[PDB]
PDB file of C-alpha atoms and ligand atoms in Angstrom:
ATOM      1  CA  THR A   1      -9.173  25.289 -30.892  1.00  0.00           C
ATOM      2  CA  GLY A   2     -12.934  24.656 -30.468  1.00  0.00           C
ATOM      3  CA  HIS A   3     -13.710  23.359 -26.979  1.00  0.00           C
ATOM      4  CA  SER A   4     -15.416  19.990 -26.450  1.00  0.00           C
ATOM      5  CA  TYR A   5     -16.211  18.188 -23.184  1.00  0.00           C
ATOM      6  CA  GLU A   6     -15.825  14.769 -24.755  1.00  0.00           C
ATOM      7  CA  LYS A   7     -12.459  15.601 -26.332  1.00  0.00           C
ATOM      8  CA  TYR A   8      -9.108  16.550 -24.803  1.00  0.00           C
ATOM      9  CA  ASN A   9      -8.570  20.343 -25.245  1.00  0.00           C
ATOM     10  CA  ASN A  10      -5.146  21.981 -25.695  1.00  0.00           C
ATOM     11  CA  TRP A  11      -4.160  24.820 -23.422  1.00  0.00           C
ATOM     12  CA  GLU A  12      -5.190  27.652 -25.746  1.00  0.00           C
ATOM     13  CA  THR A  13      -8.593  26.030 -25.907  1.00  0.00           C
ATOM     14  CA  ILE A  14      -8.790  25.577 -22.095  1.00  0.00           C
ATOM     15  CA  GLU A  15      -7.793  29.164 -21.492  1.00  0.00           C
ATOM     16  CA  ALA A  16     -10.434  30.439 -23.909  1.00  0.00           C
ATOM     17  CA  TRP A  17     -12.963  28.206 -22.096  1.00  0.00           C
ATOM     18  CA  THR A  18     -12.024  29.579 -18.649  1.00  0.00           C
ATOM     19  CA  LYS A  19     -12.912  33.028 -20.005  1.00  0.00           C
ATOM     20  CA  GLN A  20     -16.096  32.043 -21.824  1.00  0.00           C
ATOM     21  CA  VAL A  21     -17.536  29.802 -19.136  1.00  0.00           C
ATOM     22  CA  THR A  22     -16.990  32.673 -16.684  1.00  0.00           C
ATOM     23  CA  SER A  23     -18.580  35.353 -18.820  1.00  0.00           C
ATOM     24  CA  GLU A  24     -21.674  33.225 -19.473  1.00  0.00           C
ATOM     25  CA  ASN A  25     -22.176  32.377 -15.768  1.00  0.00           C
ATOM     26  CA  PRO A  26     -21.365  35.572 -13.801  1.00  0.00           C
ATOM     27  CA  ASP A  27     -23.661  34.594 -10.911  1.00  0.00           C
ATOM     28  CA  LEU A  28     -21.889  31.250 -10.475  1.00  0.00           C
ATOM     29  CA  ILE A  29     -18.313  31.534 -11.645  1.00  0.00           C
ATOM     30  CA  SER A  30     -15.497  34.016 -11.104  1.00  0.00           C
ATOM     31  CA  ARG A  31     -12.062  33.533 -12.580  1.00  0.00           C
ATOM     32  CA  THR A  32      -8.686  34.624 -11.194  1.00  0.00           C
ATOM     33  CA  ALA A  33      -5.032  33.712 -11.888  1.00  0.00           C
ATOM     34  CA  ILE A  34      -3.119  32.588  -8.827  1.00  0.00           C
ATOM     35  CA  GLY A  35       0.326  32.900 -10.419  1.00  0.00           C
ATOM     36  CA  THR A  36       2.309  32.179 -13.586  1.00  0.00           C
ATOM     37  CA  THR A  37       4.186  29.065 -14.728  1.00  0.00           C
ATOM     38  CA  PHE A  38       7.957  28.951 -15.428  1.00  0.00           C
ATOM     39  CA  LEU A  39       7.008  29.772 -19.064  1.00  0.00           C
ATOM     40  CA  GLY A  40       4.552  32.516 -18.316  1.00  0.00           C
ATOM     41  CA  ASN A  41       1.261  30.827 -18.779  1.00  0.00           C
ATOM     42  CA  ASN A  42      -1.513  32.031 -16.496  1.00  0.00           C
ATOM     43  CA  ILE A  43      -2.518  29.640 -13.696  1.00  0.00           C
ATOM     44  CA  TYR A  44      -6.301  30.068 -13.654  1.00  0.00           C
ATOM     45  CA  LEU A  45      -8.589  29.243 -10.751  1.00  0.00           C
ATOM     46  CA  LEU A  46     -12.387  29.282 -11.104  1.00  0.00           C
ATOM     47  CA  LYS A  47     -14.512  30.040  -8.065  1.00  0.00           C
ATOM     48  CA  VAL A  48     -17.752  28.166  -8.473  1.00  0.00           C
ATOM     49  CA  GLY A  49     -20.770  28.837  -6.253  1.00  0.00           C
ATOM     50  CA  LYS A  50     -23.410  31.405  -5.327  1.00  0.00           C
ATOM     51  CA  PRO A  51     -21.471  34.310  -3.821  1.00  0.00           C
ATOM     52  CA  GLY A  52     -22.151  34.953  -0.153  1.00  0.00           C
ATOM     53  CA  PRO A  53     -20.511  36.091   3.060  1.00  0.00           C
ATOM     54  CA  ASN A  54     -17.901  33.929   4.789  1.00  0.00           C
ATOM     55  CA  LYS A  55     -18.428  30.741   2.751  1.00  0.00           C
ATOM     56  CA  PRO A  56     -16.572  27.462   3.406  1.00  0.00           C
ATOM     57  CA  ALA A  57     -14.945  25.839   0.367  1.00  0.00           C
ATOM     58  CA  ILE A  58     -13.668  22.716  -1.281  1.00  0.00           C
ATOM     59  CA  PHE A  59     -10.477  23.071  -3.319  1.00  0.00           C
ATOM     60  CA  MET A  60      -9.979  20.786  -6.388  1.00  0.00           C
ATOM     61  CA  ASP A  61      -7.162  20.781  -8.966  1.00  0.00           C
ATOM     62  CA  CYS A  62      -6.450  18.777 -12.083  1.00  0.00           C
ATOM     63  CA  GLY A  63      -3.442  18.674 -14.331  1.00  0.00           C
ATOM     64  CA  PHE A  64      -0.605  18.328 -11.770  1.00  0.00           C
ATOM     65  CA  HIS A  65       0.972  15.793 -14.111  1.00  0.00           C
ATOM     66  CA  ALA A  66       1.150  16.608 -17.816  1.00  0.00           C
ATOM     67  CA  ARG A  67       0.338  13.229 -19.442  1.00  0.00           C
ATOM     68  CA  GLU A  68      -2.749  12.461 -17.289  1.00  0.00           C
ATOM     69  CA  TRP A  69      -5.168  14.039 -19.750  1.00  0.00           C
ATOM     70  CA  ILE A  70      -8.329  12.554 -18.212  1.00  0.00           C
ATOM     71  CA  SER A  71      -7.540  14.741 -15.194  1.00  0.00           C
ATOM     72  CA  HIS A  72      -7.779  18.057 -17.150  1.00  0.00           C
ATOM     73  CA  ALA A  73     -10.887  16.775 -18.826  1.00  0.00           C
ATOM     74  CA  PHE A  74     -12.587  16.136 -15.470  1.00  0.00           C
ATOM     75  CA  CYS A  75     -12.114  19.624 -14.130  1.00  0.00           C
ATOM     76  CA  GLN A  76     -13.985  20.945 -17.173  1.00  0.00           C
ATOM     77  CA  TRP A  77     -16.725  18.336 -16.966  1.00  0.00           C
ATOM     78  CA  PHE A  78     -17.215  19.246 -13.320  1.00  0.00           C
ATOM     79  CA  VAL A  79     -17.753  22.908 -14.134  1.00  0.00           C
ATOM     80  CA  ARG A  80     -20.391  22.307 -16.811  1.00  0.00           C
ATOM     81  CA  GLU A  81     -22.269  20.031 -14.393  1.00  0.00           C
ATOM     82  CA  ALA A  82     -22.283  22.662 -11.704  1.00  0.00           C
ATOM     83  CA  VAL A  83     -23.851  25.188 -14.049  1.00  0.00           C
ATOM     84  CA  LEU A  84     -26.293  22.983 -15.998  1.00  0.00           C
ATOM     85  CA  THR A  85     -27.799  21.537 -12.872  1.00  0.00           C
ATOM     86  CA  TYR A  86     -27.777  24.427 -10.407  1.00  0.00           C
ATOM     87  CA  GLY A  87     -31.403  25.109  -9.604  1.00  0.00           C
ATOM     88  CA  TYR A  88     -32.538  21.661 -10.904  1.00  0.00           C
ATOM     89  CA  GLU A  89     -30.653  19.047  -8.966  1.00  0.00           C
ATOM     90  CA  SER A  90     -31.170  19.512  -5.213  1.00  0.00           C
ATOM     91  CA  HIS A  91     -27.707  18.405  -4.041  1.00  0.00           C
ATOM     92  CA  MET A  92     -25.700  20.546  -6.463  1.00  0.00           C
ATOM     93  CA  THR A  93     -28.043  23.536  -5.756  1.00  0.00           C
ATOM     94  CA  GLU A  94     -27.393  22.864  -2.065  1.00  0.00           C
ATOM     95  CA  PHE A  95     -23.591  22.519  -2.636  1.00  0.00           C
ATOM     96  CA  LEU A  96     -23.362  25.745  -4.640  1.00  0.00           C
ATOM     97  CA  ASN A  97     -25.555  27.707  -2.246  1.00  0.00           C
ATOM     98  CA  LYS A  98     -23.661  26.513   0.807  1.00  0.00           C
ATOM     99  CA  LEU A  99     -20.026  26.354  -0.332  1.00  0.00           C
ATOM    100  CA  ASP A 100     -17.595  27.630  -2.943  1.00  0.00           C
ATOM    101  CA  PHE A 101     -15.788  25.190  -5.216  1.00  0.00           C
ATOM    102  CA  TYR A 102     -12.244  26.288  -6.095  1.00  0.00           C
ATOM    103  CA  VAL A 103     -11.526  24.528  -9.391  1.00  0.00           C
ATOM    104  CA  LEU A 104      -7.949  24.785 -10.738  1.00  0.00           C
ATOM    105  CA  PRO A 105      -8.312  23.447 -14.342  1.00  0.00           C
ATOM    106  CA  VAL A 106      -4.604  22.771 -15.053  1.00  0.00           C
ATOM    107  CA  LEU A 107      -1.709  23.237 -12.606  1.00  0.00           C
ATOM    108  CA  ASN A 108       1.239  22.154 -14.763  1.00  0.00           C
ATOM    109  CA  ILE A 109       0.445  24.141 -17.918  1.00  0.00           C
ATOM    110  CA  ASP A 110       3.969  24.130 -19.461  1.00  0.00           C
ATOM    111  CA  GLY A 111       4.104  20.378 -19.203  1.00  0.00           C
ATOM    112  CA  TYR A 112       0.622  19.969 -20.624  1.00  0.00           C
ATOM    113  CA  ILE A 113       1.644  22.032 -23.625  1.00  0.00           C
ATOM    114  CA  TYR A 114       4.736  19.796 -24.007  1.00  0.00           C
ATOM    115  CA  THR A 115       2.630  16.592 -24.153  1.00  0.00           C
ATOM    116  CA  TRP A 116       0.651  18.275 -26.958  1.00  0.00           C
ATOM    117  CA  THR A 117       3.738  19.427 -28.821  1.00  0.00           C
ATOM    118  CA  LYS A 118       6.745  17.144 -28.290  1.00  0.00           C
ATOM    119  CA  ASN A 119       6.408  14.336 -25.793  1.00  0.00           C
ATOM    120  CA  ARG A 120       2.941  12.862 -24.944  1.00  0.00           C
ATOM    121  CA  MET A 121       4.372  11.068 -21.918  1.00  0.00           C
ATOM    122  CA  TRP A 122       5.881  14.132 -20.287  1.00  0.00           C
ATOM    123  CA  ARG A 123       4.960  14.385 -16.553  1.00  0.00           C
ATOM    124  CA  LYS A 124       7.089  17.028 -14.839  1.00  0.00           C
ATOM    125  CA  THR A 125       7.170  20.816 -15.096  1.00  0.00           C
ATOM    126  CA  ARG A 126       9.301  22.448 -17.784  1.00  0.00           C
ATOM    127  CA  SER A 127      11.739  24.486 -15.706  1.00  0.00           C
ATOM    128  CA  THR A 128      15.476  24.364 -16.163  1.00  0.00           C
ATOM    129  CA  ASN A 129      17.864  22.841 -13.600  1.00  0.00           C
ATOM    130  CA  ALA A 130      21.336  24.115 -12.792  1.00  0.00           C
ATOM    131  CA  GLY A 131      24.341  22.132 -13.915  1.00  0.00           C
ATOM    132  CA  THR A 132      22.357  19.972 -16.350  1.00  0.00           C
ATOM    133  CA  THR A 133      20.397  19.995 -19.575  1.00  0.00           C
ATOM    134  CA  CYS A 134      17.730  17.788 -17.945  1.00  0.00           C
ATOM    135  CA  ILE A 135      14.390  19.527 -17.593  1.00  0.00           C
ATOM    136  CA  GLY A 136      11.632  19.615 -14.977  1.00  0.00           C
ATOM    137  CA  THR A 137      10.537  18.791 -11.425  1.00  0.00           C
ATOM    138  CA  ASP A 138       7.763  16.392 -10.440  1.00  0.00           C
ATOM    139  CA  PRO A 139       5.222  18.856  -8.929  1.00  0.00           C
ATOM    140  CA  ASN A 140       3.860  16.080  -6.710  1.00  0.00           C
ATOM    141  CA  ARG A 141       7.283  15.524  -5.143  1.00  0.00           C
ATOM    142  CA  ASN A 142       7.733  19.250  -4.590  1.00  0.00           C
ATOM    143  CA  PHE A 143       5.578  20.064  -1.566  1.00  0.00           C
ATOM    144  CA  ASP A 144       6.786  20.398   2.019  1.00  0.00           C
ATOM    145  CA  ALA A 145       5.610  17.002   3.227  1.00  0.00           C
ATOM    146  CA  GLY A 146       8.616  14.978   4.298  1.00  0.00           C
ATOM    147  CA  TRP A 147      10.207  16.626   1.279  1.00  0.00           C
ATOM    148  CA  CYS A 148      12.389  14.326  -0.823  1.00  0.00           C
ATOM    149  CA  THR A 149      12.750  11.694   1.879  1.00  0.00           C
ATOM    150  CA  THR A 150      11.051   8.769   0.176  1.00  0.00           C
ATOM    151  CA  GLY A 151       9.852   7.798  -3.273  1.00  0.00           C
ATOM    152  CA  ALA A 152      11.543  10.904  -4.750  1.00  0.00           C
ATOM    153  CA  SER A 153      14.799  11.419  -6.684  1.00  0.00           C
ATOM    154  CA  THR A 154      17.473  14.073  -6.238  1.00  0.00           C
ATOM    155  CA  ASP A 155      18.479  13.799  -9.873  1.00  0.00           C
ATOM    156  CA  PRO A 156      16.872  16.326 -12.334  1.00  0.00           C
ATOM    157  CA  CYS A 157      17.043  13.706 -15.073  1.00  0.00           C
ATOM    158  CA  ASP A 158      14.600  11.444 -13.296  1.00  0.00           C
ATOM    159  CA  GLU A 159      10.822  11.442 -13.688  1.00  0.00           C
ATOM    160  CA  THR A 160      10.335  11.792  -9.960  1.00  0.00           C
ATOM    161  CA  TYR A 161      12.815  14.624  -9.314  1.00  0.00           C
ATOM    162  CA  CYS A 162      11.740  16.361  -6.127  1.00  0.00           C
ATOM    163  CA  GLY A 163      13.184  19.740  -7.120  1.00  0.00           C
ATOM    164  CA  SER A 164      16.068  21.847  -5.808  1.00  0.00           C
ATOM    165  CA  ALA A 165      13.898  22.510  -2.687  1.00  0.00           C
ATOM    166  CA  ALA A 166      10.271  22.347  -1.571  1.00  0.00           C
ATOM    167  CA  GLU A 167       8.180  24.760  -3.631  1.00  0.00           C
ATOM    168  CA  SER A 168      11.023  25.480  -6.039  1.00  0.00           C
ATOM    169  CA  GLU A 169       8.477  25.393  -8.825  1.00  0.00           C
ATOM    170  CA  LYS A 170       6.453  28.581  -9.335  1.00  0.00           C
ATOM    171  CA  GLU A 171       3.345  26.421  -9.832  1.00  0.00           C
ATOM    172  CA  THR A 172       3.552  24.576  -6.535  1.00  0.00           C
ATOM    173  CA  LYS A 173       4.531  27.775  -4.716  1.00  0.00           C
ATOM    174  CA  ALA A 174       1.509  29.491  -6.243  1.00  0.00           C
ATOM    175  CA  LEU A 175      -0.843  26.683  -5.281  1.00  0.00           C
ATOM    176  CA  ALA A 176       0.696  26.480  -1.774  1.00  0.00           C
ATOM    177  CA  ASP A 177       0.465  30.252  -1.396  1.00  0.00           C
ATOM    178  CA  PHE A 178      -3.220  30.248  -2.296  1.00  0.00           C
ATOM    179  CA  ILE A 179      -4.067  27.403   0.097  1.00  0.00           C
ATOM    180  CA  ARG A 180      -2.120  29.090   2.920  1.00  0.00           C
ATOM    181  CA  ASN A 181      -3.953  32.392   2.282  1.00  0.00           C
ATOM    182  CA  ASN A 182      -7.334  30.589   2.460  1.00  0.00           C
ATOM    183  CA  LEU A 183      -6.986  27.977   5.211  1.00  0.00           C
ATOM    184  CA  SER A 184      -9.990  29.357   7.076  1.00  0.00           C
ATOM    185  CA  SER A 185     -12.507  28.551   4.317  1.00  0.00           C
ATOM    186  CA  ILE A 186     -10.963  25.462   2.744  1.00  0.00           C
ATOM    187  CA  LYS A 187     -12.409  22.306   4.301  1.00  0.00           C
ATOM    188  CA  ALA A 188     -11.451  19.644   1.752  1.00  0.00           C
ATOM    189  CA  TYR A 189      -8.625  19.288  -0.742  1.00  0.00           C
ATOM    190  CA  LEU A 190      -9.127  17.098  -3.822  1.00  0.00           C
ATOM    191  CA  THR A 191      -6.364  16.517  -6.375  1.00  0.00           C
ATOM    192  CA  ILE A 192      -7.212  14.679  -9.593  1.00  0.00           C
ATOM    193  CA  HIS A 193      -4.729  12.285 -11.296  1.00  0.00           C
ATOM    194  CA  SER A 194      -4.637   9.107 -13.418  1.00  0.00           C
ATOM    195  CA  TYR A 195      -4.439   6.259 -13.733  1.00  0.00           C
ATOM    196  CA  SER A 196      -5.048   3.172 -11.502  1.00  0.00           C
ATOM    197  CA  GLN A 197      -8.600   3.633 -10.257  1.00  0.00           C
ATOM    198  CA  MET A 198      -7.884   4.506  -6.619  1.00  0.00           C
ATOM    199  CA  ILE A 199      -8.817   7.155  -3.981  1.00  0.00           C
ATOM    200  CA  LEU A 200      -5.842   7.835  -1.715  1.00  0.00           C
ATOM    201  CA  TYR A 201      -5.662   9.775   1.533  1.00  0.00           C
ATOM    202  CA  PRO A 202      -2.671  10.496   3.836  1.00  0.00           C
ATOM    203  CA  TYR A 203       0.031   9.585   4.224  1.00  0.00           C
ATOM    204  CA  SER A 204       2.253   8.736   1.301  1.00  0.00           C
ATOM    205  CA  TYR A 205       5.494  10.277   2.566  1.00  0.00           C
ATOM    206  CA  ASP A 206       5.180   7.915   5.491  1.00  0.00           C
ATOM    207  CA  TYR A 207       3.470   4.774   6.720  1.00  0.00           C
ATOM    208  CA  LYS A 208       2.046   6.607   9.721  1.00  0.00           C
ATOM    209  CA  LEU A 209      -1.749   7.060   9.562  1.00  0.00           C
ATOM    210  CA  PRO A 210      -3.638  10.307   9.958  1.00  0.00           C
ATOM    211  CA  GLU A 211      -5.591  10.869  13.183  1.00  0.00           C
ATOM    212  CA  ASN A 212      -8.821  10.598  11.257  1.00  0.00           C
ATOM    213  CA  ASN A 213      -7.751   7.672   9.112  1.00  0.00           C
ATOM    214  CA  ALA A 214     -10.807   5.743  10.301  1.00  0.00           C
ATOM    215  CA  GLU A 215     -13.199   8.400   8.951  1.00  0.00           C
ATOM    216  CA  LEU A 216     -11.199   8.920   5.757  1.00  0.00           C
ATOM    217  CA  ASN A 217     -11.275   5.150   5.210  1.00  0.00           C
ATOM    218  CA  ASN A 218     -15.075   5.027   5.649  1.00  0.00           C
ATOM    219  CA  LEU A 219     -15.545   8.132   3.502  1.00  0.00           C
ATOM    220  CA  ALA A 220     -13.297   6.740   0.722  1.00  0.00           C
ATOM    221  CA  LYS A 221     -15.024   3.381   0.996  1.00  0.00           C
ATOM    222  CA  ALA A 222     -18.418   5.020   0.511  1.00  0.00           C
ATOM    223  CA  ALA A 223     -17.227   7.166  -2.369  1.00  0.00           C
ATOM    224  CA  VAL A 224     -15.808   4.148  -4.331  1.00  0.00           C
ATOM    225  CA  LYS A 225     -19.045   2.214  -3.651  1.00  0.00           C
ATOM    226  CA  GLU A 226     -20.874   5.226  -5.119  1.00  0.00           C
ATOM    227  CA  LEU A 227     -18.613   5.407  -8.180  1.00  0.00           C
ATOM    228  CA  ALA A 228     -19.112   1.741  -8.933  1.00  0.00           C
ATOM    229  CA  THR A 229     -22.905   2.229  -9.177  1.00  0.00           C
ATOM    230  CA  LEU A 230     -22.851   3.696 -12.639  1.00  0.00           C
ATOM    231  CA  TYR A 231     -20.709   1.289 -14.743  1.00  0.00           C
ATOM    232  CA  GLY A 232     -19.171  -1.152 -12.222  1.00  0.00           C
ATOM    233  CA  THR A 233     -15.778   0.565 -12.239  1.00  0.00           C
ATOM    234  CA  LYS A 234     -13.717  -0.960  -9.432  1.00  0.00           C
ATOM    235  CA  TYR A 235     -11.543   1.394  -7.386  1.00  0.00           C
ATOM    236  CA  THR A 236      -9.340   0.609  -4.448  1.00  0.00           C
ATOM    237  CA  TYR A 237      -8.748   3.042  -1.621  1.00  0.00           C
ATOM    238  CA  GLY A 238      -6.581   3.666   1.377  1.00  0.00           C
ATOM    239  CA  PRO A 239      -3.527   5.573   2.639  1.00  0.00           C
ATOM    240  CA  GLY A 240      -1.106   6.247  -0.185  1.00  0.00           C
ATOM    241  CA  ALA A 241       2.188   4.787   1.145  1.00  0.00           C
ATOM    242  CA  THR A 242       0.584   1.421   1.547  1.00  0.00           C
ATOM    243  CA  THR A 243      -2.078   1.698  -1.188  1.00  0.00           C
ATOM    244  CA  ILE A 244      -0.073   2.912  -4.184  1.00  0.00           C
ATOM    245  CA  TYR A 245       3.520   3.376  -2.830  1.00  0.00           C
ATOM    246  CA  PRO A 246       5.419   5.666  -0.419  1.00  0.00           C
ATOM    247  CA  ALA A 247       6.247   8.986  -2.037  1.00  0.00           C
ATOM    248  CA  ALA A 248       7.318  12.157  -0.291  1.00  0.00           C
ATOM    249  CA  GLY A 249       6.264  15.723  -1.109  1.00  0.00           C
ATOM    250  CA  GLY A 250       2.711  15.238  -2.342  1.00  0.00           C
ATOM    251  CA  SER A 251       0.183  18.072  -2.126  1.00  0.00           C
ATOM    252  CA  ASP A 252      -2.437  15.835  -0.539  1.00  0.00           C
ATOM    253  CA  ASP A 253      -0.131  15.146   2.425  1.00  0.00           C
ATOM    254  CA  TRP A 254       0.929  18.768   2.625  1.00  0.00           C
ATOM    255  CA  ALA A 255      -2.655  20.133   2.594  1.00  0.00           C
ATOM    256  CA  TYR A 256      -3.676  17.603   5.292  1.00  0.00           C
ATOM    257  CA  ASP A 257      -0.835  18.789   7.516  1.00  0.00           C
ATOM    258  CA  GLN A 258      -2.120  22.355   6.977  1.00  0.00           C
ATOM    259  CA  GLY A 259      -5.292  21.483   8.865  1.00  0.00           C
ATOM    260  CA  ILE A 260      -7.410  20.389   5.908  1.00  0.00           C
ATOM    261  CA  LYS A 261      -8.838  17.130   7.226  1.00  0.00           C
ATOM    262  CA  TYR A 262     -10.438  15.793   4.049  1.00  0.00           C
ATOM    263  CA  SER A 263      -7.546  15.434   1.629  1.00  0.00           C
ATOM    264  CA  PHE A 264      -7.823  12.900  -1.214  1.00  0.00           C
ATOM    265  CA  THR A 265      -5.929  12.018  -4.398  1.00  0.00           C
ATOM    266  CA  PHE A 266      -8.071  10.460  -7.151  1.00  0.00           C
ATOM    267  CA  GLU A 267      -6.437   8.148  -9.651  1.00  0.00           C
ATOM    268  CA  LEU A 268      -8.959   7.791 -12.465  1.00  0.00           C
ATOM    269  CA  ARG A 269      -9.328   5.224 -15.261  1.00  0.00           C
ATOM    270  CA  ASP A 270      -7.990   2.995 -16.279  1.00  0.00           C
ATOM    271  CA  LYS A 271      -6.048   0.083 -14.732  1.00  0.00           C
ATOM    272  CA  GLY A 272      -3.293   0.020 -17.349  1.00  0.00           C
ATOM    273  CA  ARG A 273      -4.850  -1.093 -20.686  1.00  0.00           C
ATOM    274  CA  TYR A 274      -4.646   2.412 -22.117  1.00  0.00           C
ATOM    275  CA  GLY A 275      -2.942   3.951 -19.131  1.00  0.00           C
ATOM    276  CA  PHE A 276      -2.400   7.692 -19.654  1.00  0.00           C
ATOM    277  CA  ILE A 277      -3.556   7.486 -23.260  1.00  0.00           C
ATOM    278  CA  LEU A 278      -7.149   6.899 -22.151  1.00  0.00           C
ATOM    279  CA  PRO A 279      -9.263   7.292 -25.330  1.00  0.00           C
ATOM    280  CA  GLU A 280     -11.665  10.206 -25.707  1.00  0.00           C
ATOM    281  CA  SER A 281     -14.476   7.645 -26.026  1.00  0.00           C
ATOM    282  CA  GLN A 282     -14.095   7.041 -22.291  1.00  0.00           C
ATOM    283  CA  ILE A 283     -14.249  10.709 -21.249  1.00  0.00           C
ATOM    284  CA  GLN A 284     -17.958  10.919 -20.452  1.00  0.00           C
ATOM    285  CA  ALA A 285     -18.180   7.556 -18.688  1.00  0.00           C
ATOM    286  CA  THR A 286     -15.124   8.341 -16.556  1.00  0.00           C
ATOM    287  CA  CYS A 287     -16.277  11.864 -15.738  1.00  0.00           C
ATOM    288  CA  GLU A 288     -19.816  10.709 -14.948  1.00  0.00           C
ATOM    289  CA  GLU A 289     -18.820   8.026 -12.474  1.00  0.00           C
ATOM    290  CA  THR A 290     -16.173  10.348 -10.910  1.00  0.00           C
ATOM    291  CA  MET A 291     -18.813  13.065 -10.370  1.00  0.00           C
ATOM    292  CA  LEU A 292     -20.723  10.707  -8.058  1.00  0.00           C
ATOM    293  CA  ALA A 293     -17.622  10.170  -5.939  1.00  0.00           C
ATOM    294  CA  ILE A 294     -16.750  13.887  -5.688  1.00  0.00           C
ATOM    295  CA  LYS A 295     -20.409  14.739  -4.946  1.00  0.00           C
ATOM    296  CA  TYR A 296     -20.541  12.038  -2.264  1.00  0.00           C
ATOM    297  CA  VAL A 297     -17.489  13.501  -0.591  1.00  0.00           C
ATOM    298  CA  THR A 298     -18.935  17.010  -1.027  1.00  0.00           C
ATOM    299  CA  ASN A 299     -22.194  16.170   0.730  1.00  0.00           C
ATOM    300  CA  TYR A 300     -20.234  14.514   3.577  1.00  0.00           C
ATOM    301  CA  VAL A 301     -17.930  17.521   4.173  1.00  0.00           C
ATOM    302  CA  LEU A 302     -20.901  19.899   4.029  1.00  0.00           C
ATOM    303  CA  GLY A 303     -22.594  17.709   6.617  1.00  0.00           C
ATOM    304  CA  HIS A 304     -19.428  17.683   8.708  1.00  0.00           C
ATOM    305  CA  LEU A 305     -18.528  21.383   8.930  1.00  0.00           C
TER     306      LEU A 305
HETATM  307  N1  L06 B 401       1.967  10.139  -3.587  1.00  0.00           N
HETATM  308  C1  L06 B 401       1.153  11.100  -3.032  1.00  0.00           C
HETATM  309  N2  L06 B 401       1.627  11.997  -2.174  1.00  0.00           N
HETATM  310  N3  L06 B 401      -0.163  11.113  -3.262  1.00  0.00           N
HETATM  311  C2  L06 B 401      -0.850  10.242  -4.144  1.00  0.00           C
HETATM  312  C3  L06 B 401      -0.387  10.498  -5.615  1.00  0.00           C
HETATM  313  C4  L06 B 401       0.412   9.328  -6.270  1.00  0.00           C
HETATM  314  C5  L06 B 401       0.908   9.630  -7.751  1.00  0.00           C
HETATM  315  C6  L06 B 401      -0.137  10.373  -8.645  1.00  0.00           C
HETATM  316  S1  L06 B 401       0.205  10.244 -10.421  1.00  0.00           S
HETATM  317  C7  L06 B 401       2.176  10.431  -7.783  1.00  0.00           C
HETATM  318  O1  L06 B 401       2.207  11.679  -7.493  1.00  0.00           O
HETATM  319  O2  L06 B 401       3.242   9.870  -8.157  1.00  0.00           O
HETATM  320 ZN1   ZN B 402      -0.317  12.157 -11.288  1.00  0.00          ZN
END
């Protein structure tokens, strides 16, 4: 149960960490719970930044999908960076002074626990479905964004089950509720996944392009260029539908249609050699190169308020 930033931490460890990282950095981090999972675990959200009046924000979550462990790991890496370098690195000091970073460590907690206890390749939530023994809904097929129209299944037994309705899951409802209650401050939405090495932007539920697809393409292009500067990691980018595959009900598409103009989905390492079982030995390298990308986007948004 001892936390490590170069190891994958189980939920009890991550929860302890949310509490300890908050208590040690009261001037930079505040922790709240935005809801509970189907199984009663607390959905924590850390608010990172120097508190001030009416601050704009960037919202980032990890752990939508249970088996994408490098995702969870990144949210934690991000937080330590914020606090070790505030006051020393000009950009991060500038980011933290100017905006508030909403970091949601793990969205799908019940599923994360399941990958640690029974099935390592579990992806969905762990809720029950009526009329079947099959368990779970794909949280990224559960948002109101052309809900269940494409790239989603209506069968609970499938890995891409879209749910009984949009926001049927307490976790997606909770996340959606928080974003809706904070539209005014939230300027960018970032949702961390794995794997494939890509940076996607709207839309995935459709082949139609967002109004600012030109900017998002340039932004994404610059961010991947940035990421590649550390270890040469090659990422592709573009609108989801055409870049990865069409898939309805994703949070990135939903957030974008809420008014949040900078909405990106990051698909971290690797390209399929280890897939979801990305070794711990790649945690720092992955997190380090990903920081550059997130920071690039952060500077851009700040400079485009
Ligand atoms: N498809 C959307 N809406 N956004 C990009 C996410 C693709 C993928 C992540 S594991 C998935 O959720 O299947
Ligand atoms: Zn995913």
